[PDB]
Design a protein around this nucleic acid. Structure first.
Lengths: 989, 989
DNA sequence: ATGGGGTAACGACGCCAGACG
RNA sequence: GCGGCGCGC
DNA sequence: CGTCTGGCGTGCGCGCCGCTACCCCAT
RNA sequence: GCGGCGCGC
């Protein structure tokens, strides 16, 4: 039985081991034990913590005193109690008589000597001292024979790890000594926990204003630093005094990080606090996360772990480096594990009440300590820089910490030329650390979760450690691979985007406009004599202008961070480590700047390593260019290539004079990507030998309605497989056009019936209007969500009568759903089977759990405030989540197999990227791996799993009989020959 | 179904009627009604509040809109809804058609027109406007014929109110015009809410220190006043903005009192905040009480109620004044009610969550606004004057608000010559207001509770209003009488007490010593070379010196307030209004200075009106003197009088040269009272005609072991009645000596048996050792509590070996209880009957309730966190509480009947006081009234009551049958003839 | 020189309520 | 709110 | 359906002060 | 935490 207070106390004792504040930890334990009502709150794990702390000091008299309290409680000593005593005996070099007696008191409890080294979490120092003691009584005591590492034998992963086969794993274009410097630069960045980047904004403000504003701010910052140093020591003294009395306090937690680092962290948070304010809770969570992250770094820094990482990583780089070889071929994770690998030590995170109290302590400490004169430019009265405000719109009042408006104006006048980011929020300057487990990988020192999903994190975090270590190999390697791709900035694109940004912007080309371009009200109120209705007319006009200004400012701020980081990484090679969500779907860890983004964002990036085009590279660059224009969507590949040749003059003019020429590229569906591609095609054709032109531009091959593609494969549906290009055809099949055409026929019928909305919608049913809905309904979009997607497309039409936007989107979403239910009757059966199976599993008070064909366990976190499962989210979420785990498995298999063939592979879920030189092989692998994945009886295996995992309960059998009946009701497959996907050009195109 | 949030919202709407902030109240109601989840939180009483507020403004359109919301909710309009609408119709002078329709929509709901004026709480303005509307449709509508007032017909109270009999009600020595000035002085004091009194401390501090300290403090106080004015307006703006959003806030509550008064109140609280600190909760309760009290005063001030009180009270004084007559004789309450009496209007107090939040708001506002430089005497850095600290000794951490130590030293150096008190904390400068109901009486403007008891206040507060109005007449008149006694200070005693106080004090004569006389450690630590045991020896010595210093400082502070108020009231006549606890036992309202106190306190006071001694006054002064010495306790009255004649030289010398003569008075049991009495006897014998000497000194007649006296009467026990002087004897019977003698015989037996404690206790068993225990065991003292009382008496013996204090007090308390159980076997049976009856009543989940023979309902508040009754406190508390309600009834009857005979009567529960001239009549009345009270079948009536009140439950009958069996098991009375009490000299002596 | 920063760690016994047989 | 005392019955 | 055990509260009315202790480094 | 937007699939 765990408790809120017990969680706090146990965390306190464990914290004192990190700070070595054993007399403080012992005092609290003694005080608690000596009090009748407090003693009950203590646990064997708490006594043990203090016991292990004294063992490490060689404090036998204190360890013995804690053993007395345990027996007095009156609890019984376990494996950790005996491991602590032996450690103390080894360290103090105790007599064999005392050790033998401890080893025999252990045998009487029924505890085993060999069960201690397997079940107890110990450091290499803690392990060593216990052995020294045992070797004094039992000198012929040997630990189990190790360490032979196991390879994953999974049906689909077998040939990824098998030594049998010719591997051609890729290496970087950079030499060993270059990569070591890059490692040092990243290491330096992570030790600081901060990155300072020059802002791409301004400079348009007079110097006399700026100079004084900067001088005032530097002085105030000197005042806050001193104030915060003082506040931190005073807080530490107050909390220390609470421990001197029998009470828990966050005192040892504040003792985990250097006081100078805590103040630097708080001053960073103050400078970056948004003007509008921030949710106190959010700030508390962040402040707690930044403290923990910096303490982890500090612990490594002071324990020789950084020096150990330097030696390990510098050896590891031989696998990657151009001018270096390895003894035998292997994957990055395999070589990382071969070189070391004592796998260091794992630190369990804090209980959420400790996380929140610490964050709130520091937040309130910052509010309390930071004072400033409100008198601005004799500046007598001091006021707090920060203040609490409450948003009463939520119905449940949330607290916001907002800066003083004078402080906001001061920083604005100061016009500071730098922006600061956390080291884990920006791309890595060196190849990431390979993912070796769910707690080791990505960033060098700072900890990273393998699974992003915060909701139900405890249940998913434990199950990744629960499963066989080999089970996660596929996912761990696919993530290591994605993170291993070297990126660089397209300098030419950046200069053009900055030219527009640093002027009036260009919203038409997705570049935000500065506040100067915000709509002004024509004209500011001219009252009061007339008129009450005209005064309200201006108020609604002003409200809309304020709305647009706020919206423009949001986009401007978001672009500012993205562009400032791109400007920062301009002349550098960088890497994007990857993470997973609960479904297995992969995402980059640095959020601001990356390839999962918009057109401007994707155009700014290219592979750092190029690859000579070869005999078909240039044609692939030409097809990709045309794909990006969105002009020949319905056309076959040969006609897309023929179109590129026709518009070749406009491609070259677009490349040469982007903003001053005929600006052909600006009309593309993806203009910045088209322009980047025009630049690549121009460089290629203008090279001495285009087939030898070293090309860096990624080329994309995407699966059309990938959710439906998976459903067509699962149900072997011939009608469905034809619609979404599983079945070969010489022309691509567009389901979006298919839906729009069918909806128009429905609209024509309804308009004749007398229906008013169908009559106004004449000539408005287009692919663009329905596209997002057709695409996302397979991913769980409902008629409510779909109406909103269609509304957005109707509002942007101008010719469309905006009086009808609600009734038209409401009509269109029902028509879109109707078309899809007819076109995908087969899919509908599988969707209904999964939905019903989940509904019944959740109704029995258990969340839906399954395992991917690559051995990744998936658990739905949807529960309601143990916490009962949220039956609605569980049933509605299972078919999309199940489909996502399959597309995720497909992507991972494609990545892993492309790597063996020497390809650079990145993806945006169902959009696969590689160099133009290697598009054919990627497509071969993509199709082969889809066919291999879906050739298995996925629905049958899932059914047999759900039967074993949820139909085992001895009482009740009645709910399990109704469940078994629905799980075994697996929909029968259609006629489609899955092998045909291998011969299908437009499957991924 | 009431709620915490609902209580807050209802309080908010009611508050807006007092502030007339109807657009604010309406907005919150509208916002709440318009929201799905908030609408449910609203109640008909809340809608009605806003509805009545608009009615008062004549806002028919808004009243109608609120009526819509009520029906929409969808609730039904009640009597208050219809009274509000009619008020609005009368005030706006609406047509008869709209009124007739409202009067007929009322008839359809089943509501009655005459049921409105009886069940609805309305002002004389609210009553008048509703009638004006009704008289337009029903002109021949007449209210019930009134107001004939009823007299109490109770068996024991009948002759107190009956016109049949010769009354000689006393009048004051002061003329009418003098009393009106005194009324004006008190009125002025209450309007300010403060009394400034010169401290009787110092002056021993240099002027250069003081001057600068005062100058610094005046400046800081100017800074805090401005800061607090600003903080209050800023708080009011924040809270106002919470109401603009749909949220409740304390905004209208802050709008009840002038901003200048709120700041004056907070500045008063800051100056008086104790240096050690104060429980935040306590401070919150006080701050809320001071706001409510000042708002009540402000409301009267601005509504003409003060001018109405002036006219009423100035007419009332004719009954009291020496130079004024009344038409017919009557009691103060009767004349007060005859002159007026529209009984003004009652204001219901705030819900406890509102009381606590408001107090905490103001407390935090004071902490937040008050800043001071810590640099003391270039004083750069500002720090808060107040800060939060936590006491972790309680196990449950309580928050304390403590002043900054520099601020404490500043006020100490400043040596401010004044102390400030709340107007209700000091005696009245004019006769109090008569108690007319449980909500009207005592102080002129400030509200006073009739019942003190805070625990279970709601249950007792409602039952006093529940019972027939006549039922409380006896208690209300007895309290008015006690409050009507005019007091003055004995100047001679004050000068002597101040002489000792302003020097080194005199602890032997109960005058505290200044910190200069505190024990010093001989001598301050001389370390470090030697020795660890001697270093700890000094630590225990220092700890004890700190303990004694803290104890001396507490007594000094307590005396300082008492003496400063006595010095303030030196040349003035003052009155002490009285209150009751739940048992009916009476207490004075001003706590610091009064006759219920110590020897020094009781000696400082005398009656303001004197009474010529007459033929037996001087002898009574002589008996009283001897009584106070404690020298002739066992002696008859004639021998006490004979002793006074023998020591007459020492009485005169003591009076003449108190601190320089033979100091005979200093050896008395009550030295300051003996000295006051020596001064009175000297003035009397030295007067031209001692029988005509106008004497002011109160003479005391007390009932020996009054708890047992009541038990001996109830059980008609002859053995018991003899022991506690119910049975006449020529010598007084001392139960304390009786117990001590018996315990010594037990000790002699045990010492011979071999018992170690009995052997050490030889020669230590005295009356003083057992006295308090013998006295208080009847009032619920247990063996635990009794051991502690005996411990105190053992520790003060010096000859007694202090090693044995625990085992000796443990032995003595069992022996004391054993003696009492033998001596009072009869009592034991009644105690066991009441204890058992209560145990069973409480076991059924109901608190013990009864009614006094004077018609006062008593309810035990003992419950545990509806709240179930605390069975232990209910059973153990019933016999003492039942006995107290009888002694209380006896006191009240004695007071009421002494008043008819023209006596000045005060009491200290079972100690009755009057002038020496009137001791015989008081004793006649005391005995007559005891016999009259106990002549009734008190146990039988109580049994018949408990049978009716607790044996009426239809299911279960099994618990009620076991209860009926124990309630009807009334112990049979003994032989004692209760009529003998009338002939008993030492009953009260 | 002194305010405040830093840090050090004998006793009883009825009563019920929940935990047991 | 607990504690230390004091006082009263 | 009875017997064992452990934590709770031990008279209540009023008043005060205290809320850990203190060395010795800092201003 | 809600909201407003934007982007991605």
């Amino acid at each position: 039985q765990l408790s809120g207070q017990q969680q706090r106390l146990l965390a306190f004792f464990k914290c004192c081991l990190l700070t070595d504040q054993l007399p403080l930890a012992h005092h609290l334990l003694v005080v608690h034990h000596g009090q009748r009502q407090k003693r009950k709150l203590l646990t064997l794990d708490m006594y043990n913590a203090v016991m292990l702390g004294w063992a490490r000091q060689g404090a036998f008299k204190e360890l013995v005193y804690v053993l007395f309290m345990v027996k007095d409680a009156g609890l019984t000593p376990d494996l950790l109690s005996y491991a602590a005593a032996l450690q103390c005996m080894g360290r103090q070099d105790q007599d064999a008589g005392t050790i033998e007696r401890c080893l025999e008191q252990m045998s009487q409890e029924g505890l085993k000597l060999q069960a201690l080294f397997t079940a107890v979490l110990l450091s290499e120092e803690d392990r060593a001292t216990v052995l020294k003691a045992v070797h004094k009584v039992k000198p012929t005591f040997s630990l189990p024979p190790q360490l032979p590492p196991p390879v994953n034998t999974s049906k689909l992963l077998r040939d990824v790890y098998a030594k049998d086969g010719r591997v051609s794993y890729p290496k970087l274009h950079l030499p060993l000594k270059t990569l070591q410097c890059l490692f040092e630069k990243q290491l330096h960045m992570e030790l600081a926990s901060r990155v300072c980047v020059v802002s791409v904004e301004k400079p348009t403000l007079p110097s006399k204003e700026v100079k004084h504003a900067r001088k005032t701010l530097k002085t105030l910052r000197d005042q806050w630093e001193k104030a915060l140093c003082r506040a931190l020591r005073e807080t530490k003294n107050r909390l220390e005094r609470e421990v001197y009395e029998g009470r828990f306090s966050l005192y040892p937690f504040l003792c985990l990080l250097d006081e100078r680092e805590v103040v630097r962290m708080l001053l960073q948070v103050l400078q970056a606090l948004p003007a509008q304010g921030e949710s106190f809770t959010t700030l508390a969570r962040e402040l707690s996360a930044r403290t923990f992250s910096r303490h982890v770094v500090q612990r490594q820094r002071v324990s020789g772990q950084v020096q150990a990482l330097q030696n390990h990583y510098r050896k590891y780089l031989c696998l990657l480096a151009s001018d270096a070889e390895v003894p035998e071929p292997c994957l990055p994770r395999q070589y990382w594990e071969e070189l070391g690998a004592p796998e260091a030590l794992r630190e369990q995170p804090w209980p959420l009440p400790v996380q929140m109290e610490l964050g709130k302590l520091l937040a309130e400490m910052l509010v309390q300590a930071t004072q400033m004169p409100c008198s601005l430019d004799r500046s007598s009265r001091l006021v707090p820089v920060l203040y609490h405000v409450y948003s009463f719109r939520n119905v449940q009042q949330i607290g916001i910490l907002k800066p003083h408006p004078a402080y906001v104006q001061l920083l604005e006048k100061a016009a500071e030329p730098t922006l600061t980011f956390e080291a884990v929020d920006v791309p890595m300057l060196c190849p990431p650390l390979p993912w070796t487990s769910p707690h080791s990988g990505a960033f060098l020192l700072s900890p990273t979760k393998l699974m992003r999903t915060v909701e139900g994190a405890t249940q998913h975090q434990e199950l990744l450690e629960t499963c066989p270590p080999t089970a996660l190999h596929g996912a761990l390697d696919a993530l290591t691979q994605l993170g291993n791709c070297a990126w660089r900035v397209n300098g030419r694109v950046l200069d053009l985007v900055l030219q527009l940004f640093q002027a009036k912007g260009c919203p038409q080309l997705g570049v935000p406009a500065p506040p100067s371009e915000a709509p002004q009200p024509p004209e500011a109120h001219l009252p009061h004599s007339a008129a009450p209705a005209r005064k309200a007319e201006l108020r609604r006009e002003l409200a809309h202008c304020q709305k647009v200004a706020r919206e423009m400012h949001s986009l401007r701020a978001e672009a500012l961070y993205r562009l400032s980081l791109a400007q920062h990484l301009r002349d550098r090679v960088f890497w994007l480590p990857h993470n997973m969500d609960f479904r297995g779907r992969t995402y980059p860890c640095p959020p601001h700047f990356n390839h999962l983004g918009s057109d401007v964002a994707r155009a700014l990036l290219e592979f750092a390593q190029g690859r000579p085009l070869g005999p078909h590279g240039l044609d692939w660059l030409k097809i990709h260019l045309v794909n990006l224009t969105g002009l020949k969507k319905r056309e076959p590949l040969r006609k897309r290539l023929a179109f590129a040749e026709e518009v070749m003059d406009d491609i070259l003019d677009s490349a040469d004079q982007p903003l001053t020429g005929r600006k052909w590229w600006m009309g593309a569906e993806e203009p910045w990507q088209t322009l980047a591609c025009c630049m690549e095609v121009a460089n290629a054709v203008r090279a001495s030998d285009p087939a030898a032109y070293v090309s860096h531009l990624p080329v994309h091959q995407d699966g059309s309605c990938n959710g439906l593609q998976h459903y067509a494969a699962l149900g072997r549906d011939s009608v469905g497989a034809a619609s979404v290009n599983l079945e070969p055809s010489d022309v691509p099949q567009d389901v979006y056009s298919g839906v729009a055409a069918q909806v128009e026929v429905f609209r024509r019928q309804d308009a004749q019936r007398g229906m008013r909305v169908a009559q106004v919608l004449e000539g408005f049913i287009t692919r663009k209007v329905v596209k997002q809905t057709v695409m996302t309904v397979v991913y769980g979009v409902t008629r409510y969500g779909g109406r909103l997607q269609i509304e957005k497309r109707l509002r942007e039409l101008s010719d469309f009568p905006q009086e009808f936007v609600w009734e038209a989107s409401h009509y269109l979403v029902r028509q879109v759903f109707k078309s899809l239910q007819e076109m995908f009757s087969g899919t509908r059966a599988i969707q209904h089977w999964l939905t019903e199976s989940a509904r019944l599993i959740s109704h029995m008070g258990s969340v839906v759990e399954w395992v991917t064909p690559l051995g990744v366990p998936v658990i739905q976190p949807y529960r309601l405030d143990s916490r009962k499962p949220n039956t609605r989210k569980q049933k509605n979420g299972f078919p999309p989540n199940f489909i996502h785990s399959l597309d995720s498995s497909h992507m991972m298999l494609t990545a892993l197999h492309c790597y063996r063939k020497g390809l650079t592979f990145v993806s945006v879920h169902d959009c696969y990227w590689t160099h133009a030189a290697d598009v054919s092989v990627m497509n071969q692998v993509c199709r082969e791996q889809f066919v291999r994945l879906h050739s298995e009886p996925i629905l049958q295996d899932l059914s047999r799993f759900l039967v074993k995992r949820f139909c085992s309960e001895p009482q009740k059998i009645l709910e399990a009989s109704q469940l078994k009946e629905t799980l075994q009701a697996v929909p029968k497959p259609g006629a489609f020959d899955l092998e045909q996907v291998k011969r299908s050009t437009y499957f991924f195109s």
